[PDB]
Amino acid sequence: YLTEHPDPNNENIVGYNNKKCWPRDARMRLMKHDVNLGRAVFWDIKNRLPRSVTTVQWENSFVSVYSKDNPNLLFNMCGFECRILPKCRTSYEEFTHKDGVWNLQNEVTKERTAQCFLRVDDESMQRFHNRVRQILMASGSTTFTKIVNKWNTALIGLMTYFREAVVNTQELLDLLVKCENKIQTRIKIGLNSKMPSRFPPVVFYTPKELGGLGMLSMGHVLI
Amino acid sequence: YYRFNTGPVGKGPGCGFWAAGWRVWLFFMRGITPLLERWLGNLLAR
Amino acid sequence: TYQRWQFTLPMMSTLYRLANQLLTDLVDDNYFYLFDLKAFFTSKALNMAIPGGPKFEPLVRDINLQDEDWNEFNDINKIIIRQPIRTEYKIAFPYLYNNLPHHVHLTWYHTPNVVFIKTEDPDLPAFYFDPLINPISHREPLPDDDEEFELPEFVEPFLKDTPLYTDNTANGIALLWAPRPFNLRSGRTRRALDIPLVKNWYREHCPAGQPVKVRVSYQKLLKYYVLNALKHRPPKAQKKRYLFRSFKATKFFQSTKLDWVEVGLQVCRQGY
Amino acid sequence: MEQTLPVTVYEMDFLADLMDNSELIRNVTLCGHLHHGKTCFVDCLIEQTHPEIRKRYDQDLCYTDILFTEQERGVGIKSTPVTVVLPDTKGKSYLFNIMDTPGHVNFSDEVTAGLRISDGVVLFIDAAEGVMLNTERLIKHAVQERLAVTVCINKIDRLILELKLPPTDAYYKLRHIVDEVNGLISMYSTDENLILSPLLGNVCFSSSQYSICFTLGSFAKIYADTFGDINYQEFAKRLWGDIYFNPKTRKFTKKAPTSSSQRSFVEFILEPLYKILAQVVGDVDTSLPRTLDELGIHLTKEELKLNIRPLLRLVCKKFFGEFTGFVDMCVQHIPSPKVGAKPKIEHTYTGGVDSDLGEAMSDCDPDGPLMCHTTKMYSTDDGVQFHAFGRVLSGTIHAGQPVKVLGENYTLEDEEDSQICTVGRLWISVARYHIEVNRVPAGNWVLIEGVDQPIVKTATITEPRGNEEAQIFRPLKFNTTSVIKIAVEPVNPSELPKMLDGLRKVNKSYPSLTTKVEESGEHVILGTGELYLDCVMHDLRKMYSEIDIKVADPVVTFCETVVETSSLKCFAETPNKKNKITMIAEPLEKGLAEDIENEVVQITWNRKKLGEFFQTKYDWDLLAARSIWAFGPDATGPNILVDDTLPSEVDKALLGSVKDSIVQGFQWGTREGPLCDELIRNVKFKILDAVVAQEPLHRGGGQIIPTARRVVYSAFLMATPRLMEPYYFVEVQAPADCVSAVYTVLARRRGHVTQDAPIPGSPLYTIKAFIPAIDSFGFETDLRTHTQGQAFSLSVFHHWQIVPGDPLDKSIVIRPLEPQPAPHLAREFMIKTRRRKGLSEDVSISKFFDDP
Amino acid sequence: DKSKELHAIKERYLRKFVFEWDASEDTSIDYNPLYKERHQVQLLGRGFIAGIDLKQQKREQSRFYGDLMEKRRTLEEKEQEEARLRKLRKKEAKQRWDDRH
Amino acid sequence: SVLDFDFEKLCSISLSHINAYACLVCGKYFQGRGLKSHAYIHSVQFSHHVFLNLHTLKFYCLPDNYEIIDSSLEDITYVLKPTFTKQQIANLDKQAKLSRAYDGTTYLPGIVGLNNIKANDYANAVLQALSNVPPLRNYFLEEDNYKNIKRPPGDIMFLLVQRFGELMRKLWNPRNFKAHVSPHEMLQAVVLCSKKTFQITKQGDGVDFLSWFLNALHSALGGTKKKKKTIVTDVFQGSMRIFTKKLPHPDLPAEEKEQLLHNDEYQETMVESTFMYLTLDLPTAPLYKDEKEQLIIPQVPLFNILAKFNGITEKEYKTYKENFLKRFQLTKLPPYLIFCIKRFTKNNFFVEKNPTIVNFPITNVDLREYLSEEVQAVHKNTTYDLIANIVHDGKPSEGSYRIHVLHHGTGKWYELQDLQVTDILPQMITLSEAYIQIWKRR
RNA sequence: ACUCUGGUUUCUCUUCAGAUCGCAUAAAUCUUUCGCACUAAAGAUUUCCGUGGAGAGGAACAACUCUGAGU
Ligand SMILES: O=P(O)(O)O[C@H]1[C@@H](OP(=O)(O)O)[C@@H](OP(=O)(O)O)[C@@H](OP(=O)(O)O)[C@@H](OP(=O)(O)O)[C@H]1OP(=O)(O)O
């Protein structure tokens, strides 16, 4: 790679895509050898593909290296931000059961060997936020029942798809509680322009058959 | 105050030292004089 | 016109004595180490606050330290920690402890310690070995005494008749190290507005035992002082037109001499 | 040449004429402690010789210290050369080359650059503070460089306007200062010929703030001018040294009459000065005209309206006049380039005076072979090109002349480090302006242009097609050691080359700076302190490379050592599987490494004297005292290589064939070291056995050098290894109350206070301490902030002390970001440095062995 | 304070007309003992901070220099200082007697 | 395989240009040759026992420190310092046989890709356009042609010249270790000389960079003075006659408009000057597509844009509160003509790239009709062949630069984009949006 | 060591003034920046508070201390 694309200034690190969602010690660490290897792998893959048939952009791709310098192996797949950390590599601690963590074990020996920390990709979080915004704006004169139904469908899809990753992702939980407070606000403002201090939650979460909106909850609500 | 009220003198309404505030309000007046003059000139034109 | 003044040293000594309550009796700028205007500018430009100093909004956009992607340069496995690198260290040496020193002013380094010994007893001689001074522990190709060196009768010490010290010598030596308004003997008259009587009070460090509100008052006074000293631009050339001289030149105005209370009442009535 | 120049008392043609005569030239270095008045003294001289240049009433104008960083800091950073024509006491004008050196200890290297191209040293000592740390260090360095020494006791006005001492007490303070300087000189110099005393004219009393400069001769001449009948030389002889004056007999006697009369110095010199100062500062409006008339000084009405400080400066300028006392002091005692050439050649030239070219340079003749020697590199305002500054020792340098420039590695056997360059221009270097000249004769300082390319630190300018036996001058031996290590990288790697260029430039601007690249591609800068590195990085960011640069936190360079002998005799064979070398390593005796470093022993000595020294001072065996091969990595390196191979088992002739290769391997191994790639210090290496292949082609070269390094590493590792922290010596000038507080600061940084003696005649104390360099970062700031700025400290490298921990302790657990406790600090200092260098995670004791 | 320090290490390497300022705007909340309790200036025992009562400053001063004088002053100097203090205290007592409630 | 000589010649350890030795086993540059130099330590440490002096072009074995004399190593030196004899320079353009690199990568000298350091494709295209120009390339292929000219002491512009020549010798090397050349040194010189303009990270306009580079080459090749005739001027500069006709303000009565015709100020002037390149202004996009079956992409013949310089065409020029009619008439045709077609124009809100397609022939263009009759007699030859064609693709912001170069000796046309060298058909060149063009007068 | 200018005080006008024009410190407007702008920073312009330098004019009382020059 360096024979064909020489880098005398070690400039290969300036444009290296990395997953900013994870903390600094959890991301890929841009070691010189690791960065060069990632660039070389991407360059080889790109060379295998003729440019007219298809193009593999570096800015839209992501290469993660796991070696003696990088303990975390990161990848985004199907909206899931997965980070594998081997047990024998930078763990040194007893582990409990957390919802967002997958305990990977070798099949032949049934011994735990790595932990796959799950998260929701920021792209999926932005899609959910945009869906909530569309529901809020496209409300207009629609009945509160249909607005709550749309919010419930969005929430059910998000949770049934990102089951453990929702629990693991704190930013996502904050986003859901903010969107829920928005949906309720919309209903409340519809009920009256003045802000209803200490509005009763019973109207929102009561099932439709019993006269309520039948709204699902993901935040901490104290009745 | 917290320099005036040391030693025998305690908290009380007897501290008179008005150089600083008088300075500050004169400096504010310097800045706002042209604005009020322009407003009065506009309001008293013709 | 009351624009220039010159005083004899006894008058300035008496004035310095009468104003001793408003002066900290500092004889150096070493008291203002990492706490002067340049240090405050360096702190502001680095988006950092000196403990005794004020706090400002960032001069440039700051990127969170969690955004950097663990380069070999900032690898914490290589960094040896002995003491926490404080904000004072970075302000003292902005180009060594900062990765992006921009609009930073180098603070003045150490000045020699003024060892001026302040005289308390006027009866004592002006040139006297004060007990504050550490006593010196006493202990040469000299010419032979038998030689024929003679001094002519016209020769004597240059100022043998002149006394070594006078009653107002210690006062002058004290005036040498007085604060700036008293270091001079001739100067130019200033406006009463232009004289900040308490500017040096908050320019110094806050006293150790003080409540939280007065400390914040000190910090905010320092903040506004720094803002004035930094946003300051030199005045622009004018043509020197005076409003009141023009007013007097017209027929509509006339001059007189009036009591301040009378003109205050008259101004209040005219405003109403 | 012909160009625009500022108005001066003399004429440029006279200045050029003085340069030809080498008997009227004085090469002077004004050194001293921080803020002791050297720059203000040079400014006073410039004001004297330049009518148009006047010092501001409020701001002390500094003609030298022209850098922006120098102006902002207020601390001299780089040496400024100034060439002037100064009148003597008799009126004879002398050419003076003055190298105003910085007073800060961190920039002591700068002073060294000013000591190589100077014949005399003028040490400025504050009359209030007295002798400080940098004054002692500079005295040691100057008398060790074979230079004449004189003293200027500056700021005598502090004795009058600050301490308000009685005149007799001021005399006592001055006498104590002179005695302390004499004691220091005698301690650092075996010869007692250079006794310093104001009677001999070696000492001048000055106040550069008020322009009060006088020696005994000059002030006696003032008396001669006011009273013609007195001869000034004998009077100056009688003025100092507890000699009392009897006005009944008008005679000077060692016996004090009346038991209350003051000394000659107090009666005739000090008391009139006190009266003048007190009249100006105390009785100006009421009694200044009478004393001014008595002294013959007439001041205008506008001049008498000045403030007290400008009025003092004016009155003392009118009274004392020109600084003729300084000129006397530097003319009678500082050799001219003609007189002082022989010691300079004997000390600095590598070939020695005995060589033909050394004899040629001993004459300092303008019409000889060119042997200019430049030690400074001054950057232009734009920062692109550099001018090489140095003195011309022989011949004459001409503008537009081909020149052979020799680098620090140039030798007769290997001449590759030499380049033929064309000199562009020549300037006589005054501080703020430069006088372009066509030629510069021998014995003068010059800013050669166009020769900066082949030189980094030191140059040897000579003429091409001649001087085929010319050698280089010895590279600058530095007062201290550069320790503080900082990693430097660019913010944007795309502009990496610019920073690289900048590195080169700073490597030229700072004589002791060391910039390299480690195995991990990390750019490394070595400095002497935090202020020094601050100035270096300001230059690197603003003057040379205008790019944004990231700087790592500061770390120190550790050393490596052993504390007890190797457990087993280590050995290594060549990759040829021949030439087996078996060695052991043991620590040296106490002070032996100090003896080697301080040139007390040299490998250049013959076998007889070296063996005798090692047999008498350290009680070595005769065989052990004669088998020593080399001293450490460099010349006079702290390590020692010996061979204990008895001739029965190993042929000495055969071993001598590989002696050069083994010595090279030893030096390289001691330079690198196996713990964390750091200098091996205070280790004795004994060659127990040596098999050598008989055929030349199977030995030598790349076979025995790496084998020697491997066996050295194994011997060092099997012997119990340890790390040496660098320990700085700190002197704190603090008030009496703050002394206790000082201890508190040194409590938090592993600081050991050695002494807390007061300053005689001053209300302050000098707290001396030994603080680890790694813990010294921010110590100056901590001390000044904790004591409200009343305490000031200067730290300089002192020694190497073993780190408490054990580096080869795999049981120690070290959290990534935590200040480790003392019992395993070495374990933290070894691995982390190993990560900074780019080596493996840890080193094994059998890594370099042959069994595994 | 130690937790404040270790935290510091880690952190570095890792409407309404409000007449009075808020206490959160305060600075000088240090953990280092060298910076919390800062050794005040004792200007040779003869200089005083401006504004504060002189008698309070004299009472609360460190009294180090008083010990230094009582240790270094000769007998005659002690008598001189005692006489000066006697006269000054006499004047102060006269002023206090004049200024009574 | 590891010998890359396209970068700065400084020691990797000491940053010193002095006595830079390249290690032939790992390709790293060290300092010195003696006993205690970095190169010697590296030789005894990494066991690399072969070194080449980067300035003396002599090989050494350092552990024993003796010179190496073998002709088989000569090629390495030729890679480090390519030298072109006069007969080789003359025969350069008449070269048909392919050249093999050290690796099995056949290439045509001069047709060599330039590495794309971040976004510098515009600079690579401009440098390739200036290369493949026989006279300028021949001038820069010999170091002696420009080494001996004087320079000011504090002058940095000359770094543009020598490195550029160096670049040429790297591009036209008949025997090279690789089929590509890194322009890093040349681009660093460009950035340093332009005062942070035309950076390597951020790509700039091809026309602006070409103008600045030609002007800087012309200025730097004038030694300590403005040499009126440099190689840049001799090759690319021509003389053109500007007929500036001032105009009255349009908001005036016709009587005053004709009265101003007697002012002797609003008439044709003689502002004849020298043009380094011709700036051709495309007609505005047709906005609405034509009703015909043709594509929405506009098409304009080369002679139509080359009509402002016919002599009678009057293009309006209007500065602030003033009007002009700048008539243009060529008076001296340079041997190599440069067309700078104006694509990117700043409208009221953004920058629009003109999609007009220039219909130009690539083998015969006669400019005899654009020269004055007294001028037509001077030039015997006016038949121009297109030899270089810089084309900009994509949006004005995220644009890319490629070049079509005519390889002499053969007749093939090659499209170069960074490291991509394709064999383009001669017919397809006119289809792309031509940005800059270089024509040879024959 | 004897002669002859330059005087000081005050009022007003004009002009320059990047000088800390000011050992003090305000207001407005626009742009920019992240918040979401009294409680916020950056950049720029302008207006007020009032100076210094030079020149001119007016009127008040001093005329050779000083700066010197002519001796
Ligand atoms: O506003 P602060 O500076 O904190 O001062 C207020 C109060 O002011 P207000 O009347 O505006 O609330 C008084 O100050 P003045 O009215 O006298 O200016 C009073 O002062 P005295 O006790 O000196 O009369 C006292 O200030 P302090 O207690 O600091 O002396 C009190 O403070 P608190 O609000 O903290 O009680």
Chosen for mutation from A2, A7, A9, A69 (greatest number of chain D CBs closer than 10 Å) is: A9
- Cβ neighbourhood burial of F67 (10 Å; 0-12, 13-18, 19+): exposed
User: What is the three-state SS of D777-790?
Assistant: CCHHHHHHHHCCCC
* F379 labelled binding-site residue: no
- In sequence order, what are the residues at sequence separation of 6 or more whose Cβ sits closer than 8 angstroms to the Cβ of residue B14? none
Report the distance from CA of residue A80 to the C1' of nucleotide G32 in Å, as an integer.
39
Task: Write down how long chain C is.
Answer: 272
To which residue do tokens 């002179």 refer?
Answer: D178
Cα–Cα separations (whole angstroms), residue A68 to A58, D347, D828? 25, 54, 20
3-state secondary structure of D155: coil
How large is the angle between the packed helices D308-320 and C169-176, nearest 10 degrees? 110
Q: Which of D383, D389, D374 is nearest to D434 (CA)?
A: D389
CA distance F59 to D529: 42
Cα–Cα separations (whole angstroms), residue C244 to A202, C254, C255, D364, F216? 75, 11, 11, 77, 61
Which nucleotide is closest to C235, CA to C1'? G21
Cα–Cα separations (whole angstroms), residue A51 to A57, A147, D346, D622, F416? 10, 47, 73, 80, 15
Q: What resolution in angstroms does the PDB record give?
A: 3.5
Q: Which of D264, D265, D269, D278 is nearest to D315 (CA)?
A: D278
CA distance F163 to F255: 62
Q: Minimal Cα–Cα distance from B5 to chain E, Å?
A: 8
CA distance F419 to F120: 12
Taking the CA atoms of chain B, what radius of gyration do you get in angstroms?
Answer: 19
- Any idea what the Cα angle at residue C154 is, between residues C152 and C160, rounded to 5°? 115
Question: Strand F278-281 vs strand F273-275: parallel, antiparallel, or unpaired?
Answer: unpaired
How many helices, marked H, and strands, marked E, lie in chain A? 6, 4
Longest dimension (CA), chain B: 63
CA distance D466 to D472: 15
Residue A72 contacts residue A85 (beta carbons within 8 Å)? yes
Mutate to test the pocket of ligand 1, among B4, B11, B17 (most ligand atoms within 8 A of CB): B11
Chosen for mutation from D489, D496, D498 (greatest number of chain A CBs closer than 10 Å) is: D496
Q: Which of A57, C106, C47 is nearest to D542 (CA)?
A: C106
To which residue do tokens 């790509």 refer?
Answer: F203
E16 alpha carbon, distance to own chain's centre: 38
Q: Which of D582, D578, D572, D571 is nearest to D696 (CA)?
A: D578
CA distance F433 to F359: 10
Residue C133 contacts residue D176 (beta carbons within 8 Å)? no
- In sequence order, what are the residues at sequence separation of 6 or more whose Cβ sits closer than 8 angstroms to the Cβ of residue D622? D611, D615
Q: Which of D83, D86, D122 is nearest to D101 (CA)?
A: D122
Instruction: Dig out the tokens for E95 from the structure.
Output: 């002023």
Instruction: Dig out the tokens for D387 from the structure.
Output: 């001018």
For residue D810, the tally of other CB atoms under 10 A from its CB is: 9
Closest alpha carbon to C1' of G14, residue: C239
Closest alpha carbon to C1' of G48, residue: B34
Is the minimum CB–CB distance between D418 and chain F shorter than 8 Å?
Answer: no
Distance F353 CA to ligand 1 centre (A): 69
* F193 labelled binding-site residue: no
Residue D728 contacts residue D721 (beta carbons within 8 Å)? no
B14 lines ligand 1 (CB under 6 A): no
CA distance D94 to D342: 21
To which residue do tokens 């009703």 refer?
Answer: F291
Report the distance from CA of residue D303 to the C1' of nucleotide G71 in Å, as an integer.
27
Cα–Cα separations (whole angstroms), residue D659 to B42, D276, D646, D670, D783? 101, 73, 15, 16, 53
Among chain C residues 43-82, those with CB within 7 Å of any atom of strand G: 44, 56-59, 61
Residue D391 contacts residue D446 (beta carbons within 8 Å)? yes
Report the distance from CA of residue C192 to the C1' of nucleotide G24 in Å, as an integer.
10
To which residue do tokens 């405050």 refer?
Answer: C40
Q: Minimal Cα–Cα distance from E38 to chain D, Å?
A: 5
To which residue do tokens 């004595």 refer?
Answer: C17
Closest alpha carbon to C1' of G15, residue: C239
> Which chains touch A (3+ CB pairs under 8 A)?
C, D, F
CA distance F390 to F432: 10
Method by which this entry was solved: cryo-EM
- In sequence order, what are the residues at sequence separation of 6 or more whose Cβ sits closer than 8 angstroms to the Cβ of residue D799? D726, D727
Residue F384 contacts residue F375 (beta carbons within 8 Å)? no
Strand partners, D330: none
- Cβ neighbourhood burial of C186 (10 Å; 0-12, 13-18, 19+): exposed
Chosen for mutation from C142, C151, C166, C176 (greatest number of chain D CBs closer than 10 Å) is: C151
Question: Which strand G bases fall within 7 angstroms of a protein CB?
Answer: 9-28, 33-34, 38-43, 45-53, 65-68
* F26 labelled binding-site residue: yes
Sign for the CA dihedral angle at D497, D498, D503, D505 comes to positive
E-assigned strands of F172-322?
180-181, 238-247, 273-275, 278-281, 299-301, 315-317
Longest dimension (CA), chain D: 99
Which nucleotide is closest to C234, CA to C1'? G18
Query: Which residues does chain D have within 8 Å of residue E40's beta carbon, measured at their own beta carbons?
Result: 788
CA distance D768 to D776: 14
Task: Give the residue ranges of DSSP H helices in D694-778.
Answer: 704-718, 738-748
B4 lines ligand 1 (CB under 6 A): no
To which residue do tokens 């590599």 refer?
Answer: A89
Report which residue type is found at C215. Answer: R
Mutate to test the pocket of ligand 1, among B1, B5, B6 (most ligand atoms within 8 A of CB): B1
- In sequence order, what are the residues at sequence separation of 6 or more whose Cβ sits closer than 8 angstroms to the Cβ of residue D537? C95, C96, D486, D488, D549, D551
Question: Strand F180-181 vs strand F113-114: parallel, antiparallel, or unpaired?
Answer: parallel
To which residue do tokens 């009070």 refer?
Answer: C201
- Cβ neighbourhood burial of D106 (10 Å; 0-12, 13-18, 19+): buried
Q: A59-68: long-range contacts (C-beta < 8 A, 24 or more apart)?
A: A59/A15, A59/A17, A61/A17, A62/A17, A62/A18, A62/A19, A63/A17, A63/A38, A63/A39, A64/A19, A64/A28, A64/A38, A65/A28, A65/A34, A65/A37, A65/A38, A67/A31, A67/A33, A67/A34, A67/A37
Distance C204 CA to ligand 1 centre (A): 23
B11 lines ligand 1 (CB under 6 A): yes
For residue D431, the tally of other CB atoms under 10 A from its CB is: 21
Residue D47 contacts residue D55 (beta carbons within 8 Å)? yes
Residue F394 contacts residue F435 (beta carbons within 8 Å)? no
Closest alpha carbon to C1' of G34, residue: C61
| F/D touch flag: 3 or more CB pairs below 8 Å | yes
Query: Which residues does chain C have within 8 Å of residue D775's beta carbon, measured at their own beta carbons?
Result: 82-83
Distance B1 CA to ligand 1 centre (A): 9
Torsion of CA C144, C146, C147, C149, to 10 degrees: 100
E-assigned strands of F215-356?
238-247, 273-275, 278-281, 299-301, 315-317, 323-332, 336-342, 344-346, 351-353
Residue B6 contacts residue E56 (beta carbons within 8 Å)? yes
Cα–Cα separations (whole angstroms), residue A10 to A2, A39, B8, D458, F188? 11, 12, 71, 32, 15
Report which residue type is found at F96. Answer: A
CA distance D391 to D448: 10
Residue D41 contacts residue D152 (beta carbons within 8 Å)? yes
Kind and range of the H or E element at D356?
Answer: helix D356-362
Q: A170-175: long-range contacts (C-beta < 8 A, 24 or more apart)?
A: A171/A21, A171/A125, A172/A120, A172/A125, A173/A218, A175/A125, A175/A128, A175/A129
- Any idea what the Cα angle at residue C157 is, between residues C151 and C158, rounded to 5°? 125
Query: Which residues does chain D have within 8 Å of residue A13's beta carbon, measured at their own beta carbons?
Result: 493
- In sequence order, what are the residues at sequence separation of 6 or more whose Cβ sits closer than 8 angstroms to the Cβ of residue D802? D561, D563, D722, D723, D724, D725
Which nucleotide is closest to C57, CA to C1'? G41
User: What is the three-state SS of chain C?
Assistant: CCCEEECCHHHHHHHHHHCHHHCCCCCCCHHHCCCCHHHHHHHHHCCCCCCCCCCCCCCCCCCCCCCCCCCCCCCCCCCCCCCCCCHHHHHHCCCCCCCCCCCCCCCCCCCCCCCCCCCCCCCCCCCCCCCCCCCCCCCCCCCCCCCCCCCCCCCCCCCCCCCCCCCCHHHHHHHHCCCHHHHCCEEECCCCCCCCCCHHHHHCCCCCCCCHHHHHHHHHHHHHHHHHHHCCCCCCCCCCCCHHHHHHHCCCCCCCCCCHHHHHHHHHHHHC
Taking the CA atoms of chain F, what radius of gyration do you get in angstroms?
Answer: 26
B3 lines ligand 1 (CB under 6 A): no
